[PDB]
Amino acid sequence: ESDCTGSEPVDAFQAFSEGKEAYVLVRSTDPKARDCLKGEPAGEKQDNTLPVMMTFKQGTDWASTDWTFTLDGAKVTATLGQLTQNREVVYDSQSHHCHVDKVEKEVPDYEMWMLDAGGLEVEVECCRQKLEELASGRNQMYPHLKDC
Amino acid sequence: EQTYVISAPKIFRVGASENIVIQVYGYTEAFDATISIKSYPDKKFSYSSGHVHLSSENKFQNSAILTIQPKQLPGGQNPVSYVYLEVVSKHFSKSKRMPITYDNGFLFIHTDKPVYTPDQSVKVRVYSLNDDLKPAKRETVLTFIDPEGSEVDMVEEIDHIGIISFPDFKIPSNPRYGMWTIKAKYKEDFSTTGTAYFEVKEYVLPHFSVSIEPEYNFIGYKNFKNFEITIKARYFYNKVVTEADVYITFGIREDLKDDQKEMMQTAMQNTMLINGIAQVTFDSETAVKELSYYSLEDLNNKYLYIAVTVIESTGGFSEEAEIPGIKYVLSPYKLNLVATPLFLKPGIPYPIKVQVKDSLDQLVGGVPVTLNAQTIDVNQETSDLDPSKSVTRVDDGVASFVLNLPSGVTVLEFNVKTDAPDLPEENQAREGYRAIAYSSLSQSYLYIDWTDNHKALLVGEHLNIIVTPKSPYIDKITHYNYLILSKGKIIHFGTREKFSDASYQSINIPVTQNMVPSSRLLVYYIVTGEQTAELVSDSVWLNIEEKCGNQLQVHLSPDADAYSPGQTVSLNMATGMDSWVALAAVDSAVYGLERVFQFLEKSDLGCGAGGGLNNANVFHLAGLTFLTNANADDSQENDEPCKEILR
Amino acid sequence: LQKKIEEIAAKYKHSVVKKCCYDGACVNNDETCEQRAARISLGPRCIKAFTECCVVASQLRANISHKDMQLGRLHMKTLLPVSKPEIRSYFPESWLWEVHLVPRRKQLQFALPDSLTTWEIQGVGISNTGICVADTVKAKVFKDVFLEMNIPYSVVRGEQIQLKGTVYNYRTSGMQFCVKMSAVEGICTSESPVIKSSKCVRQKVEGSSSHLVTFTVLPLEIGLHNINFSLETWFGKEILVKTLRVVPEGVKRESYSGVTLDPRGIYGTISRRKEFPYRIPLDLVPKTEIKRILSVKGLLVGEILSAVLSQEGINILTHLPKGSAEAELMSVVPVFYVFHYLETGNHWNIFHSDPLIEKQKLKKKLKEGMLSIMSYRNADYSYSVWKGGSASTWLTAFALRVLGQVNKYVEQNQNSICNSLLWLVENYQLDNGSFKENSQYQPIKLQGTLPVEARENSLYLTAFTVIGIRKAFDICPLVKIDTALIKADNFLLENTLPAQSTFTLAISAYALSLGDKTHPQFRSIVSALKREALVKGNPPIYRFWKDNLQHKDSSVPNTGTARMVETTAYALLTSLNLKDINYVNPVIKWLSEEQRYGGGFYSTQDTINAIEGLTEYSLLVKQLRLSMDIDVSYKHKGALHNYKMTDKNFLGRPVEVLLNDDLIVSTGFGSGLATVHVTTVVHKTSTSEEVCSFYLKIDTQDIEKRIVACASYKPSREESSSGSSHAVMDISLPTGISANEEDLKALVEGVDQLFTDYQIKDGHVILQLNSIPSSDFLCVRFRIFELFEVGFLSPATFTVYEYHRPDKQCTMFYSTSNIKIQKVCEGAACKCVEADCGQMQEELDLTISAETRKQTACKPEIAYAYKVSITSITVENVFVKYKATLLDIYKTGEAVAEKDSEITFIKKVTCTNAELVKGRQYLIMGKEALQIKYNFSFRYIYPLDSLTWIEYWPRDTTCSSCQAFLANLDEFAEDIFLNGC
Amino acid sequence: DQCANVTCRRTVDNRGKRHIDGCPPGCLCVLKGPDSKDNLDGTCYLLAT
Ligand SMILES: *[C@@H]1O[C@H](CO)[C@@H](O[C@@H]2O[C@H](CO)[C@@H](O)[C@H](O)[C@H]2NC(C)=O)[C@H](O)[C@H]1NC(C)=O
């Protein structure tokens, strides 16, 4: 119900709650999506870059890797050491409770992130509709349902 | 001339085994009689009945025990109030309307302590006896009423042995403070109630201890101008309070039950507590010139309330104390008659035994007593008797008098006073009394008395009673008849041969355990001839030692004036027969209580020391109704039991 | 002067309103008569009587004498008051209350209780021969010479306490004696053990008196420590066993973590493992252990089951004080819901013993709880929030709810319930169907302007009263109160939307859910409530509600509050009444994990409604078989333990987690649904990083010492200036400080009361209040006195908070002693203060032999050891923090710190010989450290205790002979890292 | 209408039982005052179905 049009134009920093909140991966078309993937700010906003700590679980072992995000409007160039990853937030809920990322590769994957603290259910459902539209029938992974 | 006398309790008690006596006279041939309790007024239903045989072997006297079963009575809207007592035989058939009560037995509520503080647990059990003083074994309902009149808990329990243990009542952490009431009742059949009280008070930590010690427990004429009061105070670490400020307010109080009091803002004297002790003197006369009163003739039996506030000087802390009331006493003595019915028998010396007690209701000895009397005969001619004087026997407290009055006297207005060598005339004890002559149309009177009553009758001894009748038709009386009652039941009855070679004759009565703690004796003879048979009767009240049927005794081994904490000790219980025993161990300081033998003889339907205005009144004041073909003229509306008169 | 008061008393001797004159004349040197009468509510006549007697009493008290004042207190204090039942002495519980079959003779032996009491033994025989009251026999248990000691409730570590006692001699003759103290390890005494318990110094007690006893001690270790006291006399020797409770410094703070175990994923996603990480909080008091308890219970209702069935206590809301009738009802809430579960689901076989006896016990405890509220009931069957206060519509409704639910298992007095319901509907229901409150009790603070706040509060009260009436209607089904229910239901239907808060929307939705569930407007309200739902996960693992509306506040809370749990509970119960089973599972999971060890939640209302939600859900769904192998183990440490949970036992006792490692609770393939709660208790030195919803200030003054504690409410966003709701002012008293209870009584007992209830519990003065103002400060003022002497007095805390919103709070430290300075401790009488803290080395001491500096460093006990330079000094509460720079690292046993990184040191402020100067270098070697996560990086803090070797280290070489000093210093510094001992 | 305004009453027969009357059928008696007094008076309330 309602209209799912929210946050126009899409700003990544706004979609990340200006680096004040942590977000969890709830849907992803990536078959290798890390279980219980959570991203939380690891530092202050210096220039266009921003430190982001990524926690996830392999088997029964919790792991954390440090990353740096380079934000340019809606685009995000994430990197750790030599590994680089290009993303673009293609949708952001009206209250910045959830957003839909598009990761670039030969077969571009689509992801849905939401506040670890929780989000307004109607907006969470709107992000879910956007992700189902972008995925267009592809198999979805649910990284948060992995006994986190 | 042939007569019959049926004796029953004044009132029938539902569920009680009521003993009905039948005594017939003039019959030489044996015959049977049916005594019956039936429904009123139709006699359609028979609550119970019994057959009694009357013969020479039987001396033509017999007894039958009837019982009104509770289940045989309807319930609720139109409950039974009356039943019919009926006697039927070959010779006669007579009935009478008898009232019934649904009060049967006794319910004693026993709580471990009388005062509780929050979070404490009240231990409570009920002792339940039936009308015959035996374990009732009836299921019992307890109700708890808080100081605001609310029924806040109810619990019922069945009774197996006569001792009913209830679960403990937990006092709430923040309860309604004040006077709580416990009400016991039976779940079925009966209207018996029991009642107990216990207070719930808020604990407040005291700073020090304050004690008030008056000069005496009573205020007489000697201390009406000065009454010494000593106020002490000490810290709870066993040291005397060095300096403090003492404020004392005085009031006049009507009775100790009512918390109302009239203060006296004139005697608010203030003093200093030094080294633990302070003292003041209260001028009663001067202070009671306020609030009217003025004289010592007033204030009598009223109380002096004392309030003291002590303010310790170092820490400024304050603690209060009070004496609830000191009774003002106008006379050191109180007078009361003992074993002297207020009824005259024309021709018989009339005895008066006065008794002197102090402010503690203790028999005072060596107290001279002066007796005055006015007499009124049938001609209304008043006569002032010559005063007599006795001295109180110090062995029994008794001061005895014997009075010889003219045969024509009808009313005796006698007054007794104390004659103490150190008391003013106001401070003497005085009591007035009126005695009316027994009325008989044949000038026929009976007077009984048993040697004498000191000491009290001990179970196992013997009661040597003297039976003196005064009448014409004397030497034609065949026999004497007697009924012995105790605790509202006719326990004995019979007949003794009259010796033609004396005026009086001793009837011997073995005093038994059935007669504890009190009994009543009714003796009567039948005047016969022409006109109509007449019953000439008299009765006496027998005070008997309070002796248990199954005596209980508890002892502590080892016996010592004081014990040490945690000491292992043995308690030895000994009873005459196999008996249940309910034990309790309470901190005596809670008492700063119950007596069963006195509350038990409320079932005695008799009143006074015996006697009566006529035969019917003699039977009535002894707690008896009777059925007779002889004259039965009684007073008006005489259906309820007598009420003990107060003065 | 006497006549000027005789007229007053005579004027109000028989006035109906007489006390208002009385407590008007009471002394109040802090407020004028008009300020005191401004709080009077009992009506207009009382204000004028109060004002008159207040003004006249104040005029007469000018230049009075103590005798005149006291005589005036005599005139007033007698004619106007009535009486109050109270007692100054305690009477111990009676004993031997038993019945025996006595076969003519029976002896029974026992032990007399430990008490000084004149006991009275009474026997009553019952037999077929009647009743026999035996002669009462006396038994006086008495001790003529005995010692007693007064040990305080708690003592803060480091405080020097004077323990006072008394020896009593009731003999008429004086005697010699000596008391000695038993030295325990943690308790530091100035003298030393001889052979090992103190010394016997012979004194004499005079006959029939007492003698004082004093022992000064200084606790160095936290916890309960046994101390014995021996009294010796020429006639014997007595030992008095005692216990001293030593408490840490700072504030206690308690956090909670919850996890639900669903191994087969019946109610949601599978949940077999969970890791509770060990994280050291920021301002943790040094050398204090982080305590944390682990509770694993069998069902969703398992925590409440364990709370009720285990009789070691227990209140599920111990952090909230007693006093209000609400507390007395909440005392019966858990027992009721346990009974409701056991009876409705027929689960009495859980008991291994006789279930009938257990049902008996719970029924009795339910009744016992039920009498507790009788005190708060008035003659007209209304209920008052505060004993003796005015009747409250709100509390009467709540009592009707709890009683109405309990009536199912313990039948209630129908006539009483009828009178209470009718008191509600006949007097305090308006024409529009709403209910109005009679008293000034404000249970909740709502947003909006004064008119909007009025609408909101009216809606809330109407829904609350409706819930109560519905819950108790079957006891007294009158047409009159059903009509009342219709009118109120209509008010709710027309006035709920548009909503002003998710809270009132939820409670209105639940109240209407108790009636006709087919009305269209009710369905609209339920839809609006669903629209506000928050979810964690997609598909959602959790579903909960925030009490603020989305269009007013879009931020999502990070931790739960009482309003959050209460809104979620109302919504859950509304959904259960609609049989909406697909929607509640994530809600049930959220409420279950928000629960707390003990069964309760944040405040009272959220607790009762959440317990009802969990219980009703547990009875509505199929009871699964319970069978798990639950293993709790540390990650990098040994396995703690494991237990097999079945329906036989699943309320197992908790277990304390001592080791400083991360915890792991795991289970294999199982059947059932268990709950795992962890309560972390820490002690913190500061409160600055906490949100304060009250301005606080507190001081001690000298009077012509008195505590003055003031608070003022900080309204939230869109909240009016009307002030807070039901509030609590909890003032911890310092060790050995005692409060004047008369001053507190005088502040609540009168018609001009400033506070509505007071109590003194465990060293705390707890006052309660209808409302704390926003416009101005409100101050409690009460005198204090020193009970026993205390040195190095640790500060105490002053906390005020909303009773129904404990999250709206403010905690502040204060001390009753001004005492500074702390320059030095002078020689001996000193080893106890300087016992457990570091001693600085002698400055430029050349006798330290370089090998003793290395052997001390290479000690396996010494964890870290390196050379630093101090940058800043700071004094925080009871401790001193030194900011230093890490120069050269010489040893690292445990975690590592970076070179030239910032390192913090901490020493107890009460330590002088470790005085460090800013800017100077020092060699510091010691044990242990604290690893904190500040901002986004690590930080290490090192305590300065005993066996911490510190030495001043100049950088240059112009220290005359200390040139050689630095030579050997640099000798050790060179040898340590080239060897690796 | 019926039990609109008729007083009701609670009383004690000679057996100790409590009985209520004054109340027409299909209604309930509501009694004011301390529940421990045997003699109480109140009014009738119409009761429902
Ligand atoms: C304090 O007194 C208690 C009681 O005497 C002591 O406890 C006893 O200690 C002895 C050994 O010293 C044990 O054999 C007993 O079993 C203990 N009894 C109990 C009930 O625990 C205690 O040791 C004393 N404490 C000190 C510090 O002296």
Contact (CB, 8 A) for C443 and C756: no
Q: Which helix (H) or strand (E) holds C743?
A: helix C741-748
- Provide the angle, in degrees to the nearest 10, between the axes of the packed helices C393-406 and C414-427: 150
* Cβ atoms within 10 Å of B531's Cβ, excluding its own: 11
Give me ligand 1 centre to Cα C184, in Å: 12
Q: What are phi and psi of C591, to 5 degrees?
A: -65, -35
Rounded CA separation C556/A117 (Å): 6
| Contact criterion met (CB below 8 Å) for C77 and C43 | no
Q: Where are the beta strands (DSSP E) in C191-285?
A: 203-205, 209-219, 223-233, 236-247, 251-261, 273-276
Identify the three-state secondary structure at position B317: coil
To the nearest 10°, the Cα dihedral for C528, C530, C531, C535?
A: 160
Distance CA C43, CA C438 (A): 13
Atom 24 of ligand 1, nearest CA residue: C228
Nearest CB neighbour to C78, from listed B249, B582, B586:
B249
Ligand 1: list residues with CB < 6 Å. C 182, 184, 226, 228, 239, 241
Q: Which amino acid is at C842?
A: E
Minimal CA–CA distance to C104: which of B582, B580, B576, B555?
Answer: B576
| SS3 call for C152 | coil
Task: Please tell me if residue D46 touches chain C, with a CB cutoff of 8 Å.
Answer: yes
Give residue B488's region: left, alpha or beta (phi > 0; psi -120 to 50). Answer: left
Dihedral Cα C510, C515, C519, C521, nearest 10 deg: -30
Are residues C287 and C246 in contact, defined by beta-carbon separation less than 8 angstroms? no
Residue B611 near residue B522 (C-beta atoms within 8 A): no
Q: Tell the residue number behind the tokens 């003194």, with chain if given.
A: C760
The technique by which this structure was obtained is: X-ray
CA atoms of C658 and C676, how far apart (whole Å): 17
At A80, the amino acid letter reads L
Considering the domain architecture, whether residues B194 and B224 belong to the same structural domain is answered as: no
CB B12 within 8 A of CB B84: no
Q: Which domain holds residue B88?
A: 3-101
Instruction: Please give the distance, rounded to the nearest whole angstrom, from the Cα atom of residue C835 to the centre of ligand 1.
Output: 26
**Which residues are paired to C130 by β-bridges?**
C127
How many CB atoms lie under 10 A from the CB of residue C69? 13
CA–CA separation, B509 and B496 (whole Å): 11
Residue C762 C-alpha from the chain's centroid: 10
CA nearest neighbour of C523 among C567, C490, C493: C493
- The tokens describing C294, both together, are 């682990």
Distance between CA atoms of residues C237 and C230, nearest Å = 7
CATH number at residue B35: 2.60.40.1930
Does B321 lie in the same domain as B278? yes
C244 Cα distance to chain centroid:
20
What is the end-to-end Cα distance of chain A in Å, rounded?
30
Kindly give, in sequence order, each residue whose CB lies less than 8 Å from that of residue B102, ignoring residues fewer than 6 positions away. Answer: B14, B70, B189, B190, B191, B192, D14, D15, D16
Distance CA B582, CA C274 (A): 60
Distance, C-alpha C378 to centroid of its chain: 30
CA D36 – CA B185 distance, rounded (Å):
13
Region class of C928: left (phi > 0), else alpha (psi between -120 and 50), else beta: left
SS3 for B183? strand
Q: How far is CA B166 from CA B125, C360, C717, in A?
A: 6, 15, 58
DSSP helix/strand/coil, B407: coil
Please tell me the distance from the alpha carbon of residue B581 to that of residue B552, in angstroms, as a whole number.
8
Note whether B115 and B11 are same-domain residues. Answer: no
Q: Which amino acid is at C848?
A: I
Between the CA of C80 and the centroid of ligand 1 the distance, in Å, is 57
Determine the 3-state secondary structure of B545 from DSSP: coil
Exposure letters C789-813 (e unless 16+ CB within 10 A, then b):
ebbbbbbbbbbbbbbbbbbbbbbbb
For C845-954, strand residue ranges (E) read 864-876, 879-892, 902-908, 921-926, 930-934, 937-943, 949-953
Q: Give me the amino acid identity at C972.
A: F
Taking an 8 Å cut-off on Cβ atoms, the answer to whether A97 and C540 are in contact is: no
Breaks (C-N over 2.5 A) in chain C follow: 195, 704
Contacts for A32-39: CB closer than 8 Å, 24+ residues apart: A33/A111, A33/A141, A33/A143, A34/A58, A34/A143, A35/A143, A35/A146, A35/A148, A36/A143, A36/A144, A36/A146, A36/A148, A37/A143, A38/A116, A39/A67, A39/A113
Backbone discontinuities in chain D, residue before each (C to N > 2.5 A):
none
Instruction: Measure Cα distances from A7 to A74, A92, A127 in Å.
Output: 11, 6, 12
Output the known binding site of A for (9Z)-hexadecenoate: 34, 65, 67
Alpha-carbon distance B181 to C200, whole Å?
56
Ligand 1 atom at shortest distance from the alpha carbon of C183: 27
Separation between Cα atoms, residue B588 and residue C458, nearest integer Å: 57
Q: In this structure, which amino acid lies at residue A99?
A: H
B634: left (phi over 0), alpha (psi -120 to 50) or beta: beta
Q: In sequence order, which residues have a C-beta less than 8 Å from that of residue C704 and are 6 or more positions away?
A: none
Dihedral sign (CA C171, C172, C177, C180):
positive
C-alpha–C-alpha distance, residues B247 and B309, integer Å: 5
Candidate from D16, D17, D36 with C-beta closest to B150 = D36
How many other C-beta atoms lie within 10 A of the C-beta of residue C500? 20
Which amino acid is residue C628, in one-letter code? M
Measuring from atom 7 of ligand 1, which residue has the nearest CA?
C241
- Cβ(C844)–Cβ(C962) below 8 Å: yes
Structural domain of A140: 1-148
Give pairs for C287-292: CB < 8 Å, separation 24+.
Answer: C287/C836, C287/C943, C287/C945, C288/C222, C288/C248, C288/C249, C288/C682, C288/C683, C289/C658, C290/C660, C290/C680, C290/C681, C290/C682, C291/C656, C291/C680, C291/C681, C291/C682, C292/C656, C292/C657, C292/C663, C292/C678, C292/C679, C292/C680, C292/C681
The Cα C276–Cα C256 span in angstroms is: 11
User: Are B263 and B188 members of one domain?
Assistant: no
Resolution (A): 3.0
3-state secondary structure of C205: strand
Alpha-carbon C194 to chain mean position? 42
Beta-strand relationship, B270-274 and C655-656:
unpaired
Q: How many CB atoms lie within 10 A of CB B281?
A: 12
Neighbours of C76 (CB within 10 A): 22
Q: What is the DSSP string of C42-60?
A: S-HHHHHHHHHHHHHHHHH
**Are residues B306 and B401 in contact, defined by beta-carbon separation less than 8 angstroms?**
no
CA B623 vs. chain centroid, Å, equals 15
Q: How crowded is residue C365: how many other Cβ atoms within 10 Å of its Cβ?
A: 19
How many domains does one find in chain D?
A: 1
CA angle, C263 then C269 then C273, to 5°: 45
Q: Are residues B247 and B285 part of one domain? A: yes
Q: Which residues contact B576 (CB under 8 A, 6 or more apart)?
A: B548, B549, B550, B551, C104, C129
Q: How far is residue B255 from each of residues B218, B260, B302, measured CA to CA in Å?
A: 14, 8, 7
C115 CB neighbours in chain B (<8 A) are 565
Radius of gyration of chain D (CA): 11
B238 to B432, C177, C816: CA distances (angstroms): 54, 17, 32
Take residue C392 and report the two structure tokens written for it.
């409250």
**What is the greatest pairwise CA distance in chain A?**
44
Q: Which residues of B touch D (CB under 8 A)?
A: 75-77, 79, 81, 101-102, 143, 145, 148-151, 181, 183, 185, 190-191, 193
β-bridge partners, B436: B343, B411
Backbone angles phi, psi at C341, to 5 degrees: -65, -50
The bridge status of strand B208-214 relative to strand B193-200 is unpaired
| Best residue in A35, A121, A129 for a mutation probing chain C (most C CBs within 10 Å) | A121
Identify the CA nearest to C559 among candidates C506, C596, C608.
C596
Report d(CA C51, CA C45) in Å as an integer.
10
Contacts 24+ apart (CB under 8 A), C243-247: C243/C151, C244/C151, C244/C155, C244/C187, C244/C217, C244/C219, C245/C153, C245/C154, C245/C155, C246/C154, C246/C155, C246/C156, C246/C157, C246/C186, C246/C219, C246/C221, C246/C222, C247/C154, C247/C155, C247/C156, C247/C157, C247/C222
| Helical spans, DSSP H, in B430-492 | none
Q: Is-contact B472 B455, C-beta < 8 A?
A: no
Beta pairing, strands B12-13 & B93-101: parallel
- Please give the full DSSP string across C776-811, using - where no structure is assigned: S-EEEEEEEEESS-EESPPPEEEEEEETTEEEEEEE
> What CA–CA distance (Å, rounded) separates B87 from B95?
6
Residues B40 and B152 in one domain: no
Q: How many domains does chain A have?
A: 1
Q: What's the length of chain D?
A: 49
User: Nearest CA to B325 among B267, B268, B270, B254?
Assistant: B254
Q: Does chain A reach chain C with at least 3 CB pairs under 8 Å?
A: yes
Instruction: Give the list of residues 6+ apart from residue C958 with CB closer than 8 angstroms, or none.
Output: none
Residues D19, B150: C-beta atoms closer than 8 Å: no
Asked if residue C81 lies in contact with residue C19, where contact means CB atoms within 8 angstroms, the answer is yes
For the CA of C227, the closest atom of ligand 1 is: 27
Task: Based on the fold, state whether residues B213 and B175 are members of the same structural domain.
Answer: no
Q: Are A146 and A31 in contact (CB under 8 A)?
A: no
Of B12, B77, B142, which to mutate for an interface test with D (greatest number of D Cβ within 10 Å)?
Answer: B77
C-alpha to C-alpha distances, B329 to B217, B325, C774, nearest whole angstrom: 10, 12, 66
Q: What long-range pairs does C967-976 form, CB within 8 A, spacing at least 24?
A: C968/C846, C968/C848, C968/C849, C968/C850, C968/C853, C969/C850, C969/C853, C969/C923, C971/C850, C972/C850, C972/C851, C972/C853, C972/C854, C972/C857, C973/C867, C973/C888, C973/C890, C975/C854, C976/C854, C976/C857, C976/C858, C976/C865, C976/C890, C976/C891
The SS3 of residue B59 is coil
DSSP state of B351: E
CATH number for the domain that contains residue A22 = 2.40.128.20
Taking CB atoms and an 8 Å limit, are B149 and D34 in contact across chains?
yes
- Which one of C479, C481, C486 makes the best mutation probe of the D interface by having the most chain D beta carbons within 10 Å? C479
- C175's enclosing H/E stretch is strand C175-181
* Cβ–Cβ below 8 Å for B149 and D35: yes
- In this structure, the strands spanning B318-328 and B218-219 are parallel
Distance to chain C for D47, nearest Cα, Å: 4
B478's tokens: 């065949």
CA-CA distance, C760 to C753, in Å (whole number)? 18
Q: Are residues B192 and B129 in the same domain?
A: yes
Cβ neighbours for C411, distance < 8 A, ≥ 6 positions apart:
none
DSSP secondary structure code for residue B475 in this structure: G
Please answer whether residues B352 and B376 qualify as being in contact, where contact means their C-beta atoms are separated by less than 8 angstroms. Answer: no
For C414, the enclosing helix (H) or strand (E) is helix C414-427
The tokens describing C200, both together, are 């016997």
In this structure, how many other beta carbons lie within 10 angstroms of the beta carbon of residue C540?
A: 25
What is the helix (H) or strand (E) element at residue C23, kind and residue range?
A: helix C19-24
Name the percent of chain D in helix, strand, coil, to the closest 5. Answer: 0, 40, 60
Within 8 A by CB and 6+ apart from C789, the residues are C161, C162, C736
